[PDB]
Amino acid sequence: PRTPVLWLHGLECTGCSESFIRSAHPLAKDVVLSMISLDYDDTLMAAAGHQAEAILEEIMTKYKGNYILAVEGNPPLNQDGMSCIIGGRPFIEQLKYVAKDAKAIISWGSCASWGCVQAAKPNPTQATPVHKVITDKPIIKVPGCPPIAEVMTGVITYMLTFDRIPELDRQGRPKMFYSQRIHDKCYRRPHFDAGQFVEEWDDESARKGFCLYKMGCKGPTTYNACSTTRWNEGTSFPIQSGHGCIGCSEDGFWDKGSFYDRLTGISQFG
Amino acid sequence: AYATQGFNLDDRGRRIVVDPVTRIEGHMRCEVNVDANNVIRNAVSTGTMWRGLEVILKGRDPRDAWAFVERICGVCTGCHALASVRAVENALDIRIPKNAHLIREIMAKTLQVHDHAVHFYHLHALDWVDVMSALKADPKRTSELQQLVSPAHPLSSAGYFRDIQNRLKRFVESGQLGPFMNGYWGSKAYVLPPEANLMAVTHYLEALDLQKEWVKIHTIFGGKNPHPNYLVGGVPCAINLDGAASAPVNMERLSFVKARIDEIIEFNKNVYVPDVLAIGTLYKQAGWLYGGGLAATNVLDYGEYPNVAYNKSTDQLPGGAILNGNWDEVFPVDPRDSQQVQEFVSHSWYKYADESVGLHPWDGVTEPNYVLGANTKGTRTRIEQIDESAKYSWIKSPRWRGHAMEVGPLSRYILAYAHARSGNKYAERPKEQLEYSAQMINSAIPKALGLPETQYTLKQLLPSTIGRTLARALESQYCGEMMHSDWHDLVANIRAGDTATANVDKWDPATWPLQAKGVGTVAAPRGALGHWIRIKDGRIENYQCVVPTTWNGSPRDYKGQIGAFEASLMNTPMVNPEQPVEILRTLHSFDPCLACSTH
Ligand code: NFU
Ligand code: SF4
Ligand code: SF4
Ligand code: F3S
Ligand SMILES: [Cl-]
Ligand SMILES: [Mg+2]
Ligand code: NA
Ligand code: NA
Ligand code: NA
């Protein structure tokens, strides 16, 4: 038998679901057909309305304390929770209900992990990360906007193989994917180390792949696997394609000033 | 009960609720009323989420806006970034270099293909395809069907279909049906034979594996997919052919992009378009021509993909507005005209100073107001039946000169057809596609499957759920073809000696006018997208988005006129009122993006 996954959606853009299906190793097809049982997921599921909601009860009963709750997006607390409505009720009520009997909870992406764009100032819906609402369950944060596809499926693969949560850092992120800053192994580091920087877009330095620090790159303060694992089966990552990291896996990255404002105190990242 | 736009709305019948609407992006609730014969006589579209990006953007730097609004949606990923940079560039009088234009067009067309194909197979197909019926299918007859539907597709042997069928069989036999759990399998609303179902489910699996390849085009130019990076003034992916290895774009990277484009063209031509033509033919033969809604009268798009940059007369999907089903008169659409695009909130969870009027988006206001009408059944936090006489959605109500319009690929294809018949040469390819498709649906496919020939015109065939689905597939094909040409133009320009990718003359806010306004429009996968910005002292004064699903999914306006979703559901019989198969089939034909609609 395959471990049930109930994949809930709060306030979100659905980019985490999309990233998930880009996975090449393993293929999402193989994850869905041979690894997990994806029993609830609004994006892909055949059933709607009453038939969809009835699945939750059935899986929770049959697999009590032996299903994974995956959460994409987050619950709003303003508007009496009705800035995100499921089955005529606030999303937060569904989240809490499904969370109570989960074996483990995966907070997909920066939405579930931290709050992300809807939680940026002034946060009109009081969108709140999952770990601030569910306080009595094991949660793994898999941040990024969205996370890398193979990181998402990598977490699932570990959990299914070992029936354990992988080792987490103090922020609740898996060390196997989030131990390095972008800047640690970024291929532009030799330019950073030599003070070789892009100063204006498409200057001669940019055409030579010089470091993007002075164009606002937040790689020095951002933990993710982008510089090594890279994106879409190792095809590229933001810096390789010419734009600085915007810090999309870090808590509160929308409210650290302009993406194009450089980090201060360059000497601390040498 | 009341009449509007030729629809006789009546809420006296049996009320049916569908919440959540699944196999869409984001959150929607749908309610309908059906008459004594299970025919829908009222429909209510409720957007059930809001995040408030327009509010969040206030006071921020226009150069950062694209990244915020990109996160409106990870499905139509990048189209908001494109609208944003266009809006800021329009505000600040910035002309981007040719290579940046071409790379943006390639990225846009890559999104079109990916979004369209994934939608059809992974969200829409299960409304037409019975997966349990596919288990009954005979592999050899499926092979023979595949050869008739698309001769050129190399994956066609009986053994191949047998292997696929076997994996599906043990999956279902396991007792853990996953995404197929509690489905509406066996409903009389399903009409395909087993072998067509097996063919389609096989292509669902093929498309799921292939779709990840196509987006590598985004990854090269924009670093990642979902959410590739954009830039005010151009693109960040600087060019060097040669130290070429160190530049974001070199010839090797461009050759990789071309290889991906070529694969896309094969998929659209051999898998996607043929499947939609075949499925459409079979449901046409069953008489399922419901779901036309507003497509039969009022359609709109801003127009997109000019052959010559900044020259709108050369749009390869030429736009405008059609009213009252008169395809001989296309009205020009101006997104700058305060009297054209306007949004009402009379029946939405927002407030204006005066809700009897619609606001043009440069004057738009986004203040939440979650309140339910007196005739609601249930409570503020436990709705049993929504009261559509009052405020019932997080989606605003966009109208054009007061008219309710349908937007999307179907709208663009009707507009293209109308333009082509006015003499517009830029629309010749979509006209060719439509005439080809009608001939296949009416004559060629029926002849090959031993069914009677029909004589539907495009005027009769296009305004329908089948037509809406067809237009999406044809648009995917056309977009693949267009970016193939864009790629050649890009490489030619670079080899001619123009390597420029960014205009930075007005990158620094010290160079900007102290006040400015701009608009950026995009033919997004689901229809007409616009971002309207006001800039003051280097900061965002106002930022308003009107998104395709905002148009299509909108609630009623001040005059009580219905939007595209609500109109499309009207007058549709349901086989079983508590199985929303027909509701899903038609709603899904719009490819609803609810996070987009509400932002
Ligand atoms: N296409 C599209 Fe989006 Ni997720 C919508 N509606 C965009 O603008
Ligand atoms: S984390 Fe980013 S990509 Fe994922 S749902 Fe949230 S906004 Fe979208
Ligand atoms: S600042 Fe950014 S571009 Fe430069 S070396 Fe560090 S991560 Fe790479
Ligand atoms: S913007 Fe995000 S995708 Fe990686 S390079 Fe930076 S953490
Ligand atoms: Cl965040
Ligand atoms: Mg808006
Ligand atoms: Na730099
Ligand atoms: Na552009
Ligand atoms: Na006609």
Author numbering:
A (entry chain S): 5 to 274
B (entry chain L): 3 to 244, 247 to 603
Which passages does the manuscript contain on this structure?
A prominent member of these so-called Knallgas bacteria is Cupriavidus necator H16 (formerly Ralstonia eutropha H16), which employs four different O2-tolerant [NiFe]-hydrogenases for generating cellular energy from the controlled oxidation of H2 in the presence of O2.5 Among them, only the tripartite membrane-bound [NiFe]-hydrogenase (MBH) is directly linked to the respiratory chain. The MBH large subunit contains the catalytic center composed of a nickel and an iron ion, which are coordinated to the protein by four Cys-derived thiolates. The most distal cluster relative to the active site is a [4Fe–4S] cluster coordinated by three cysteines and a histidine, while the medial cluster is a [3Fe–4S] species with three cysteines as protein anchors. However, in the proximal position, instead of a standard Cys4[4Fe–4S] cluster, the O2-tolerant MBHs possess a [4Fe–3S] cluster coordinated by six cysteine residues.13–16 The unique architecture of the [4Fe–3S] cluster is associated with a redox-dependent structural flexibility that allows two redox-transitions within a physiological potential region, i.e., the cofactor can assume a super-oxidized, an oxidized, and a reduced state. In order to obtain insight into the individual role of the supernumerary cysteines in the coordination and function of the [4Fe–3S] cluster, we purified C. necator MBH derivatives carrying exchanges of cysteine for glycine at the positions 19 and/or 120 in the small subunit HoxK, which are hereafter referred to as MBHC19G, MBHC120G and MBHC19G/C120G.
H2-reduced MBHC19G crystals harbored an almost cubic [4Fe–4S] cluster in the proximal position. In contrast to the native [4Fe–3S] cluster, the bridging function of the Cys19-derived thiolate was replaced with a sulfide (S4) coordinating both Fe1 and Fe4. Surprisingly, the Fe3 coordination to Cys120 was essentially lost. According to the electron density maps only ca. 20% of Fe3 remained in the native-like (“classical”) position, previously observed for the Fe3 in the native [4Fe–3S] cluster. Approximately 80% of Fe3 were shifted by 1.4 Å to a position corresponding to a cubane corner (Fe3′), thereby forming a bond to S4 instead of Cys120. In H2-reduced MBHC19G crystals, a major fraction of Fe3 is not covalently bound to Sγ-Cys120, which is in contrast to the reduced [4Fe–3S] cluster of native MBH. This result can be explained by the fact that sulfide (S4) is a more tightly bound ligand than a thiolate, which leads to coordinative bonding to the shifted Fe3′. We interpreted this density as a mono-oxygen species with an occupancy of about 50%, causing a slightly enlarged Ni–Fe distance of 2.7 Å.
